Amino acid sequence: AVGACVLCNSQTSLRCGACIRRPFLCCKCCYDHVISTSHKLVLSVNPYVCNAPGCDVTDVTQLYLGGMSYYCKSHKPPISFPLCANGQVFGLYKNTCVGSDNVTDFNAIATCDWTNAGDYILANTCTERLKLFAAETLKATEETFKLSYGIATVREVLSDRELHLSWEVGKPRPPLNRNYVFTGYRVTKNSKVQIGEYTFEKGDYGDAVVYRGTTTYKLNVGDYFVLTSHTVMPLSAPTLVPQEHYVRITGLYPTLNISDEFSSNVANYQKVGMQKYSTLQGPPGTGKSHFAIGLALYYPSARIVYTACSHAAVDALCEKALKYLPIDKCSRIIPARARVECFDKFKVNSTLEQYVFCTVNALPETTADIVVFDEISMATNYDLSVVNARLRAKHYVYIGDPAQLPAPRTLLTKGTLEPEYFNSVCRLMKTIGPDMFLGTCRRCPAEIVDTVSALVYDNKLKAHKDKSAQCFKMFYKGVITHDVSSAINRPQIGVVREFLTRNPAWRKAVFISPYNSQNAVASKILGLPTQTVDSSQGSEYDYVIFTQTTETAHSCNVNRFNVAITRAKVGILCIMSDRDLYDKLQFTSL
């Protein structure tokens, strides 16, 4: 269990204690880190403590060898030397410790709180290995934070599926959704056993909550639910593989006379084949899904696997491939939990397929020939290197868009994060530009593209279809009630319920609510197709209903609204409460 250092990458086997991830450190490097930082614990083939039981000194600043063990000054034997090296820390291997000085950045990485944008932007500016370490330690910080969440001390249960929820006092009570995982523990002075993997979502109305779990008892009074965290695995592969140019094709099987929409893109495809990899910088709605389908149509011969960040995007991609590509050569890998529904029409996790699909957190450790991944704003730098390690192919394809919202990054609560700094790929794609760019959207008609180009985008965007004349708006405020986290604007729901009937082809209009409580209560009231922004995006729908509850940085986000409106096909109607934002667009007011 020995390796190289991190700052100097010299052969060493010492690790710091206070640093949570405990990485390999050299003599001089670790010495400088403990001199600067308050880390006063070093791990080795044995711990560093005052061996004398009458002392409990763990500081590396003073610890004196008792011949074979470490001692303090009040316990140091005469014939013995302190093990604080000559401007270093005594340890294993000293004669081959190559020098490196850039420790202050690493010192700050292990010091900052990941609450200020400076932490995140600087973490995207360090060395590759430093970047991997920063990503892993941020992931661990997030896991530790979510572990220290509310313990739901309940008292009542309503039904075989409905229960009554209540929490303790002091720790953050997490919200309720299928993404979370909980488990009750029976406290009978013994048998504190797991009652099943429970996921929770709020009930319909009042103090009523729906409970669902892997097993299902009728829960008692004294139990509680704690959010557990999942471990973080170290990684080795680089986040980005190096680029190499070529002259001729890299061994791909083309299809002569296959289609027409992608013949104009064959030059782009061969440009991709000219390099080890290629990326995609284009605005959303440009049919980049169908563009990827046609790119596959160019060389649909090798045995390939694909993936996407979320489920809705990969399900839409599966449908698009089914529509274009032959069915019995593509598959979608599903997870064991599967608490979120998926494309329940294809092969159920058939890994032995020619064009496979999956999710980020369910990817296998196999290999392929080419690959594409959906969205870089949704992804960090950790998963990039993770898929770099588990999957190794000859060509890689990446897609993304600057105008999409980034990953949640809940710990970052101050300031705004620049789109180029969402990940390493974002900085690269904003620094060197696109590999190929497509700025025409087939989903939305002319009025929507004009509004998006005028308001948030650059005045460059265009479309192919004329206005559908289905533009409407409303402004009145409505009141909220401070529900779970945020609240719901119920009078708007009542007004929509009363009014909708006049709109004939809008019964299937996709209701939009980023807030889970409103997203559920809207379906509870009438049953419109419910949807949230994150579960949206990348796709497009004929009939959409947007609902803004109140005004706040979350709801007033320009990016949220613009990525929400890029999902209109033939008709849409949105409610809102902001004045200047209401004046901003160029549609019918009504």
Next chain:
Amino acid sequence: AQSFLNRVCGVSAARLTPCGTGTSTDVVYRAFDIYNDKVAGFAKFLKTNCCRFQEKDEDDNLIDSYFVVKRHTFSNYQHEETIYNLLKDCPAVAKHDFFKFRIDGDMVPHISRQRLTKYTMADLVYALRHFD
């Protein structure tokens, strides 16, 4: 039509006579034990979705051997196919078959159970514990 009968009758003889009516699901009155939140009990019920095809023998004499074929959703199709694939060794499981027919322009799933008995055990038990 009759191609549906031909597909259902896969390999084992061909002595079928539809007790139902082509693609119509013949309805019967059979006993059941069921417990699911909304209801709970052990009583008689009306079975609906069962295309019963009694297999006869040589000289066209009828015998107790029924090919029940049922249609359901699509998720259930894969789920039951997987679980049966797990357990397809024990001699205690009735031989199954899975396919999708085209009654119309629809990919409707089908599940086939071969060489069954006219009455289950629940009917026999219920006939003795509720005698009249």
